[PDB]
Amino acid sequence: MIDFLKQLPHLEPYGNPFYFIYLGIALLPIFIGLFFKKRFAIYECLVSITFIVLALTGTHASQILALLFYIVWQIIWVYSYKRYRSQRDNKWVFYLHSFLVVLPLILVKVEPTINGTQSLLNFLGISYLTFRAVGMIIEMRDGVLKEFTLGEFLRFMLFMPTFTSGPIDRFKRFNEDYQSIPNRDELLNMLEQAVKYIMLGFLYKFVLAQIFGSMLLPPLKAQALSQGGIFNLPTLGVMYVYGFDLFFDFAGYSMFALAVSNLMGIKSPINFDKPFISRDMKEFWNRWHMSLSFWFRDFVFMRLVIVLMRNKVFKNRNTTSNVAYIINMMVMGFWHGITWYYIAYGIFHGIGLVINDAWLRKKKTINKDRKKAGLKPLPENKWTKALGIFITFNTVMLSFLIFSGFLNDLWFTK
Amino acid sequence: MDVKAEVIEIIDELFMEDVSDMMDEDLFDAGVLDSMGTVELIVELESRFDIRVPVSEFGRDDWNTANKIVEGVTELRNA
């Protein structure tokens, strides 16, 4: 039966421009449908499942069963908590349920540590789907969620545009968006938006990321490995080439997802907002992988801070924040995987954000120490801004060198 | 005490600024509450009012003025 799925046809999600002809034809009824305030429940479910299955039917086509396990597993625990949270409500019951919901994803991440192989529970979207699932567990806990169909829940948790690696969503907003179809002019406004996003994505992914990714990066790596040592000028090379590739590949993908999402009526959250022109490490995370960043803000960061203030575990205002940054970004690192360089990239932005936070407050203390001394406030102009942007950009790019795990091949061929 | 007059006390208890009669002030715009100040107020609102108020759903538009915190305290006190 595993053999049947490896026999089954396979389509790379936004893998070629040819993919859109299918998905276009496929989405076409749904979109026309929205103009008459109609959704085709069964058809949407069909088209969703086919393109999801096609995305998961590679050489490791077995992963589709891993998905179905995952769905049953999620329904079991999502509803377990729904049923519980109706009557009573406890800290530790919530904790347990959260852990159980994330557990498949934890096993997937931990499996190469213990073994050297992927988990059997591993399928493609697992990393991004888990957020959607825990989302509800957290939201029921807060009492901001009470009602939902298994329909509503599955619709949200296994949404097809944002499945593979797409923009992360929250239930309440998604369901609200799906609940009322947008009116005629607003709707084909989304068509304009979609055709824009598809075209930009074509350039971003197939052209620009092609140049950085498959054209310039592989020889530069070969050069950097040839020259050896802790660093070299070709390693500074791979730092920027990858950095742009990582950006274009993902940002283009995101736009694709957003566009396809728009063609299914709903407007999914945005992942990038010109992240490189950011002056600040704080501003970078308001501009880079935003859906992931914004999620981690409101679910991992804000929630850990609330704990460190309910308990008042740390002495002053600033240290609670700094522990929160470090832990919060470190979790995100683990989210990418349990490899040294992910946890490293984790702690990098951790210490990064603490540095950044302390400097902002040190800038006010130097402005208080001058304005009350007789001098004019320390200069802020065009070249100061530019310097910030320059410093931020290189810190960011360096983190991407860490994140690539190219350093793993450069330092430890061994 | 009333659910408007008691919030008036605590606001200047660990920040030191009065917004009684002019209360529709955006306190993020006023410079009273910072990025880490909200949590400090919400924890003393958690303690003194005995009310647990959620943070995953908290947005910038929601609880920004001293009126939209007073009117949000009465809503999460009974229903």
From Swiss-Prot, chain A:
The active site is at 336. It comes from the Bacteria. The keyword Thylakoid does not apply. Pathway: Cell wall biogenesis; lipoteichoic acid biosynthesis. It is a multi-pass membrane protein. GO terms for molecular function: acyltransferase activity. Residues 37-40, 88-90, 143-149, 180-183, 265-274, 312-316, 374-381 are cytoplasmic. Keywords: Acyltransferase, Cell membrane, Membrane, Transferase, Transmembrane, Transmembrane helix. Belongs to the membrane-bound acyltransferase family. NCBIfam families: LTA_dltB. This is Teichoic acid D-alanyltransferase. It comes from Streptococcus thermophilus (strain ATCC BAA-250 / LMG 18311). The gene is dltB.
UniProtKB/Swiss-Prot annotation, chain B:
The modification O-(pantetheine 4'-phosphoryl)serine is found at residue 35. One of its GO terms (cellular component) is cytoplasm. Pfam families: PP-binding. SUPFAM superfamilies: ACP-like. InterPro entries: ACP-like_sf, DltC, PP-bd_ACP. It comes from the Bacteria. Residues 1-77 form the Carrier domain. 4'-phosphopantetheine is transferred from CoA to a specific serine of apo-DCP. The keyword Phosphoprotein applies. It is found in: Cytoplasm. Keywords: Cell wall biogenesis/degradation, Cytoplasm, Phosphopantetheine, Phosphoprotein. Coiled coil: none annotated. GO terms for molecular function: D-alanyl carrier activity. GO terms for biological process: cell wall organization; lipoteichoic acid biosynthetic process. Its main location: cytoplasm. Pathway: Cell wall biogenesis; lipoteichoic acid biosynthesis. Gene3D superfamilies: ACP-like (1.10.1200.10). Belongs to the DltC family. Carrier protein involved in the D-alanylation of lipoteichoic acid (LTA). The loading of thioester-linked D-alanine onto DltC is catalyzed by D-alanine--D-alanyl carrier protein ligase DltA. The DltC-carried D-alanyl group is further transferred to cell membrane phosphatidylglycerol (PG) by forming an ester bond, probably catalyzed by DltD. D-alanylation of LTA plays an important role in modulating the properties of the cell wall in Gram-positive bacteria, influencing the net charge of the cell wall. This is D-alanyl carrier protein. The lineage of its organism: Bacteria, Bacillati, Bacillota, Bacilli, Lactobacillales. The gene is dltC.
